Write a protein that binds this DNA or RNA. Structure first.
Ligand SMILES: [Mg+2]
Lengths: 87, 95, 97, 106, 82, 97, 106, 95
DNA sequence: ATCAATATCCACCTGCAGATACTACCAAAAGTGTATTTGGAAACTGCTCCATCAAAAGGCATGTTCAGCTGATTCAGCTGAACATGCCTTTTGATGGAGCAGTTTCCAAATACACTTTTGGTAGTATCTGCAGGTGGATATTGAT
DNA sequence: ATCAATATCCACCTGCAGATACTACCAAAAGTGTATTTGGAAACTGCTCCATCAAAAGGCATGTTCAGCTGAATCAGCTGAACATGCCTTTTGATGGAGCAGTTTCCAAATACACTTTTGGTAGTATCTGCAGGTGGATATTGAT
């Protein structure tokens, strides 16, 4: 392999309109301007927690590839069971 | 070319009985398959624990029955309990 | 020139998004965030595409349900506007603290 | 040769279930009634959800049950909702629900 | 002087609980709401404990019956065995 | 004639009860309630002494923690007085409703 | 004969842990080092809590660890608190904590 | 009459290593015993799942280690891991 | 501010509930030796599907505008905190008996094991159909006036 | 209420992705049938420890009074919604290649007895002591003036 792009600040790919849509689905009518950064922070913590466990399952299996099943077991561990992906 | 089992065909049989003209998408089938596996694991688990708590090495329909009562809410438990009792009773008389 | 009043398009969007089931975050941006976070735990990881989709369904369902709790905390305060304090209260009561 | 399923009058596979109880390390021994009772509970539960989901599909002028229909079925039923209270159905969305104070005028 | 059993959970007792919870001021309607909440709590837990009792073929609810009931309700208790 | 102001004793009591660990419901009435509730599931039951104790400890821990959440809900609404709506919000967010 | 605990440098009983793993329906087989590892982990966490609970006894002018002391140790420690975040220690009470807004105005 | 096993003696030993002049009430000892039982079950439970997920028939210290990483918070995990590895080394290099 | 009521702190005293130390005991682990079973790493290799890329399709960013929401201010009136004590409920302890738990027993049902049938999954090729997404064209809903 | 901008609602309409259809095969299920082991129910019973109650303890029901909190009303300020506008980024389809996963060989490690030794739990008995209450005396806090 020759070169691989640096990943930084991808949290901002979670845009104001994307977050507003999620709030709409959750029944929110009016959104303070500070909600967007708070939400990004909250989502980061959520992902860190799930990805950490998921990746732990990956390494235990001695794989380089994080599977749908690694994620599904990570979610089950955290009491956020997901149906729809083999789990 | 390893074989992957699912409850799909049995979910489909039961679907035809309740709604003969209705189909199911593969994604909905995948969720149905996850639901059956999930409930399976939850009942087996309680039955496992229950057996251990009473110093028993055997999981019998009795353990499954208590597990069902512990696991399912009110009316679903009541009906599940009849369905499983009925099936065992029938099964006993049938050999 | 025509204008809807503040709140009217907002309720329209609530009906629209409560009606449908598609993911609300763009795929690639979400995929990059996943890879960024994972890379910080462990380098040279690959992802099955369904693994990314799984994380997306789980994260979007988590955020939608958090926003409902948040909305309830706002309304408790006699407001209609969600603030960071509402999210924080929801998370505290949920035992995410 | 009659399957243990037909013997118990069941669609769900008793044999499969007996096997899964063994490989699953739940106990030293599995009683013969256990997979029979379990397979019926499982069949009952799936009948209950397909009934309700089938209805949501019909209510939506649809012939095919999709994940949204399963979610409407589960969330609209008090008992299925509680049984699956910590479960997420991918591509299910939410129930339409807007809080009172949010509606216009008075 | 006949009194309902739930009413045996008295205002001062509920007041003390609130206090340990750091509550300074308490509305009059709280006492009834609390009793309701306690009743739902005990129903859920006792239901499961008794279910464990019946399974063992006993007529006595044991500390373990209760401790196991609590564990499966996600309210693990330490101090009484297990 | 000497009188303490509203909230002075309340604070004094918070301090007192946060210091100690004794149960704060009287044993007997609690025991009756437990027995009454159990009678609807099975008749002619007996209770180990420690069984009732375990229930009391669990019930008091639960209620004490719910009052903390309730109090946060009252303060969120900019009050210092707990109301049933505060307990209701705390339970709804906890996922008990 | 020299015990496995003494071999591993541990106060916690390897033999017992090994036995409990076997009869716990955890898997068909249990590797030789697994009970050793597990016993070490359990001893370690025990020491961690007894360390901090001992200290809380000291701070409160006492030599006997009571449940109150185990409670203070666990909830004053961010990590032990998280591990035991869904556990109730009987006769532990709560941390002294009053919301600032409830304090009298100076 | 029947034997009631407990971690009491081993917990008391560790107490003396850590605070030789401090004692422990019965109730506190009973809590410590629950704690050890609870953590055991959590860790063995996870190790069980890990082995099963990976189609393995044996729970090895590798599974115990991964279980610990999945269950313990950061610093707690780190030490438990090193305590565990340390004990498995000492046990290997012992005749 | 001072002043007095009463809560709170701390040093010292002490009885006994609850901790600990000890011996003789026995069932039951836990450990040691030897015969046997097998689970899983390694080594090779078919092949899925993941990373990556070029074109095509639609959502995002940004600035302006002002509607109406939030949060500050004030105020009256309602509602909960504080208060004192004998009634009455709970606590404490003393005593018969229910049932839990420990023991032996013996057989219905469990595991094991081996040829024998059945079937659920796939895989390769084929034809089928429900509905998403496009359209145009009639019926609300919303907000200015 | 009336007029008009724009969202919304069907109804019908073509392509097609995804679903249902078969024919052929097959490895592994699942069943069948018989020999071999045993878990746990069933029955009897000893002794905890539980429900009950008598005598002692001591917390709480009670109504009064008013501090101070809650919620209504009013309003200025400014934040956040709507929408126009300009265009970047994602979505979608297509294609070499890493690593996952399938199969098979091969030994280090774990199960399975049995036999030999010890340790941990109970129990009987007696022994020890940390500290919860109680006292007594100084000092801080709170509330009144
Ligand atoms: Mg990085």
């Amino acid at each position: 392999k020759r070169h691989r792009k640096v990943l930084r600040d991808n949290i901002q790919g979670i845009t104001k309109p994307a977050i507003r849509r999620l709030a709409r689905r959750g029944g929110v009518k009016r959104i303070s301007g500070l909600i967007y950064e708070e939400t990004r922070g909250v989502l980061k913590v959520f992902l860190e927690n799930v990805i950490r466990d998921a990746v732990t399952y990956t390494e235990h299996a001695k794989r380089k590839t994080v599977t749908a099943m690694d994620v599904v077991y990570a979610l089950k561990r955290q009491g956020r069971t997901l149906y729809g992906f083999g789990g | 070319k390893t074989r992957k089992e699912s409850y799909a065909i049995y979910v489909y049989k039961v679907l035809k009985q309740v709604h003969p003209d209705t189909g199911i998408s593969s994604k909905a089938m995948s969720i149905m398959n996850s639901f059956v596996n999930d409930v399976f694991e939850r009942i087996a688990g309680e039955a496992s624990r229950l057996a251990h708590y009473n110093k028993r090495s055997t999981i019998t329909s009795r353990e499954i029955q208590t597990a069902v009562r512990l696991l399912l809410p009110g009316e679903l438990a009541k009906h599940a309990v009849s369905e499983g009792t009925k099936a065992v009773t029938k099964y006993t008389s049938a050999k | 020139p025509h204008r809807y009043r503040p709140g009217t398009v907002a309720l329209r969007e609530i009906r629209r998004y409560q009606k449908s089931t598609e993911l609300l975050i763009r795929k690639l941006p979400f995929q990059r965030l996943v890879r960024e976070i994972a890379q910080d735990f462990k380098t040279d990881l690959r992802f099955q595409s369904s693994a990314v989709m799984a994380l997306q369904e789980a994260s979007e369902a988590y955020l939608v349900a958090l926003f409902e709790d948040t909305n309830l905390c706002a309304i408790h305060a006699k407001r209609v506007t969600i603030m960071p304090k509402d999210i924080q209260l929801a998370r505290r009561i949920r035992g995410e603290r | 040769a009659k399957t243990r399923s037909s013997r118990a009058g069941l669609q769900f596979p008793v044999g499969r279930v007996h096997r899964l109880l063994r490989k699953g390390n739940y106990a030293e021994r599995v009683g013969a009634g256990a997979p029979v009772y379990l397979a019926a509970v499982l069949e009952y539960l799936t009948a209950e959800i397909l009934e309700l989901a089938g209805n949501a599909a019909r209510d939506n002028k649809k012939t095919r049950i999709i994940p949204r229909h399963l979610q409407l079925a589960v969330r609209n039923d008090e008992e299925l909702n509680k049984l699956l209270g910590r479960v997420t159905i991918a591509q299910g969305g939410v129930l339409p629900n807007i809080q009172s104070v949010l509606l216009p005028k008075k």
